[PDB]
Write a protein that binds this ligand. Structure first.
Ligand code: MG
Ligand code: MG
Ligand code: ZN
Lengths: 141, 38, 111, 117, 94, 136
RNA sequence: AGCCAGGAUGUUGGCUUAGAAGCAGCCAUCAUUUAAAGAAAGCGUAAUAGCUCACUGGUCGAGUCGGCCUGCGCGGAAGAU
């Protein structure tokens, strides 16, 4: 990574064997190889975990095929499986549906430590406190 | 450009400087905001 | 072009004048004559009217006779005493206001 | 902009570390991107961020007012932009080499390497 | 903590009071206790900035006039209806 | 809209607008709107000025009305001659003096309240000015 | 006030949506990294992107910014022999 020119990002599903519902022909106008998907991308996809959203970073100009660099998982997904109800609410922040404990969002947010600016490990917990304040979920420290 | 009467500063690029006996409104970014007669 | 012409759209129903009626009078022909005072605009003969009481429309119609005194003028301006009567309108009550409006057609284009 | 009382927070923190300081190193952050600053931040990720600096006291009426107590090398350091850093631990070990070896990428400006104690 | 530099009014009445408003002054009076009331004139430009603070109406003030220092408190302030101006201020000894 | 429900007498003659206003300060609200000029204010103006203040800051904040017309103000027809009695009652008017607080405001911020009174100022026929809490 | 840089990570904040990622709305508007950065003042996109402001650094350098009460003016101000 040196200068911004051409990149694409979108979350794909690893639950099926070689799927492309989101992209297909609409992966990229630059001429990204469809055959290279099963050869390259599926090597490290099934090796880690399946089910969650998996983003992508593509940089191709005259190389045809390519390789990929490691990524970081989002925080909004960690408020689904490792928190309360998965469907949603509908009502605004005025009414509070769910709740959070001190045990939650401490070692769960530790999985994001691959790529973060935050130096201190105790500071990572306080960053998620503000995130839950959007929905308005009460937490008992 | 309009004339109307009041200048009314809309954007940060609004100028409002007097020319001859009749003040004008000059805006380089948005030519629609050009006005006279204030 | 043939298609564009086919269209018949009138997009304006702007009021021509608005008048309040007071001190009803009786007439043999129309059954009633409602004395009026135009507060705004100009009242016309063949232009349609909307009779409403307390913001809701009690009755609707098109004027048949616009008559002030024995003059029976076809037009009445605002703030000039005026007179009105219409067929098929039974009950005249004070405090209601009659809204007259002209009808115009904008015209249409194909695209 | 902060008033005189709040300005003394940056001064007294620097003045107390003049006698107790060990090593300092400088670099021109002018013309530079936040991603170029993030190299020194991810360098401090092993050391936890509290030990390291590059925290800009670079005004000549802030840090250069706290210089005249002891160890004056800031006579000709004044002009242009300077990155002040003070550490209670620290050796005269490899810590210079990361700034020197980074000059393959150019690093925008190095201030012509003025040098500090 | 407030020092009001003032003078004793030579003239009185409606004709006298309107002449003071032309010269940026305004009429006042210091009354209360066993002492008789005395009509005092205050400067508009100095006084008008002080009552913006809440401490003017609560804390005690000292009107300096001919080396007296009566030490009085604010009671009732008449303002000009359609402008930001002061007509007359009542004072009470304490 | 905004007229007397019942009246002791149907018509007032004419009257004069002289002297200064009563309420120099705002009794109920924190901020408000004071009228500097002198003139006749119809019941349609204060209705139109209230409609601007009705939808400005949505839900938060409350407004008061310190004025009321209570003056019949008759109007003659056009082509009618002079005399033949006095005209019928058409629209109501509030005569106000300089220094009268027309409108008030409490649960709105200071800078946001200046915008609301600026819109209502253009609706009125005379010049207006902002006022503070002014406790004493 | 110019000139010379940054103007962010978590995070597409939650929610409403075909899609609104700071910028059509609603409520909350904090916490890390921080020289400094508002979960966002404006332009822009179908929506991202892009480019600025606030804030702050370098350079230069001593008066600068925004209101209140007034003296006297400017526009608003077009008619027929
Ligand atoms: Mg010219
Ligand atoms: Mg003029
Ligand atoms: Zn403009």
């Amino acid at each position: 990574a040196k200068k911004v020119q051409a990149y694409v990002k979108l979350q794909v599903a690893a639950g099926m064997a070689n799927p492309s519902p989101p992209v297909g022909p609409a992966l990229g106008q630059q001429g990204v190889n469809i055959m290279e998907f099963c050869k390259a991308f599926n090597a490290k996809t099934d090796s880690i975990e399946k089910g969650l959203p998996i983003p992508v970073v593509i940089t191709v100009y005259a190389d045809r095929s390519f390789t990929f660099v490691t990524k970081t998982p989002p925080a909004a997904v960690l408020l689904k499986k490792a928190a309360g109800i998965k469907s949603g609410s509908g009502k605004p922040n005025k009414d509070k549906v769910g709740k959070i404990s001190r045990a939650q969002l401490q070692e769960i947010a530790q999985t994001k430590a691959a790529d973060m600016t935050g130096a201190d490990i105790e500071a990572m917990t306080r960053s998620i406190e503000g995130t839950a304040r959007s929905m308005g979920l009460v937490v008992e420290d | 450009m309009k004339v109307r009467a009041s200048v009314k500063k809309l954007c940060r690029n609004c100028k409002i400087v007097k020319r001859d006996g009749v003040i004008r409104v000059i805006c380089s970014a948005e030519p629609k905001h050009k006005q006279r007669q204030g | 072009a043939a298609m564009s012409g086919m269209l018949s759209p009138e997009l304006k129903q702007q009021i021509i004048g608005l008048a309040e009626v007071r001190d009803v009078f009786k007439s043999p022909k129309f059954g009633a004559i409602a004395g009026c005072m135009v507060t705004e605009g100009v009242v016309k003969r063949h232009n349609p009217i909307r009779v409403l009481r307390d913001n809701v429309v009690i009755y609707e119609g098109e004027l048949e006779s616009l008559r002030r005194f024995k003059d029976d003028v076809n037009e009445v301006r605002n703030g000039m005493e005026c007179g009105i009567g219409v067929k098929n309108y039974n009950d005249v009550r004070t405090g209601d206001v009659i809204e007259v409006f002209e009808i115009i057609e904008i015209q249409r284009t194909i695209a | 902009m902060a008033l005189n009382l709040q300005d003394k927070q940056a001064i007294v923190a620097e003045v107390s570390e003049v006698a107790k300081g060990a090593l300092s190193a400088v670099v021109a952050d002018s013309r530079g991107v936040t991603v170029d600053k993030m190299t020194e931040l991810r360098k401090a990720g092993r050391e936890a961020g509290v030990y390291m600096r590059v925290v800009r006291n670079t005004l000549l009426r802030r840090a250069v007012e706290g210089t005249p107590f002891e160890c004056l090398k800031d006579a000709f350091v004044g002009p242009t932009l300077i990155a002040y850093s003070m550490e209670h631990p620290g050796a005269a070990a490899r810590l210079f080499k990361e700034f020197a070896k980074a000059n393959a990428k150019f690093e925008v400006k190095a201030a012509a390497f003025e040098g500090e104690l | 903590m407030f020092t009001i530099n003032a003078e004793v009014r030579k003239e009185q009445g409606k004709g006298a009071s309107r002449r003071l408003r032309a010269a940026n002054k305004f009429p006042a009076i210091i009354y209360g206790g066993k002492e008789a009331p005395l009509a005092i004139e205050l400067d508009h430009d100095k006084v008008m900035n002080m009552q913006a603070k809440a401490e003017f109406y609560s804390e005690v003030l000292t009107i300096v006039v001919d080396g007296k220092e009566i030490k009085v408190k604010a009671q009732d302030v008449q303002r000009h209806p359609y402008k930001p101006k002061l007509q007359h201020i009542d004072f009470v000894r304490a | 809209m905004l007229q007397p429900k019942r009246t002791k007498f149907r018509k007032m003659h004419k009257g004069r607008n002289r002297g200064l206003a009563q309420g120099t300060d705002v009794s109920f609200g924190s901020f408000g709107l004071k009228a500097v000029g002198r003139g006749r204010l119809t019941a349609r103006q204060i209705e139109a000025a209230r409609r601007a203040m009705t939808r400005a800051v949505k839900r938060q904040g409350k407004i008061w009305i310190r004025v009321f017309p209570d003056k019949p103000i008759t109007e003659k027809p056009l082509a009618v001659r002079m005399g033949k009695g006095k005209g019928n009652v058409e629209y109501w008017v509030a005569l106000i003096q300089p220094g009268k607080v027309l409108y008030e405001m409490d649960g709105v911020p200071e800078e946001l309240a200046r915008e609301a009174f600026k819109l209502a100022a253009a609706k009125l026929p005379i010049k207006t000015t902002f006022v503070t809490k002014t406790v004493m």
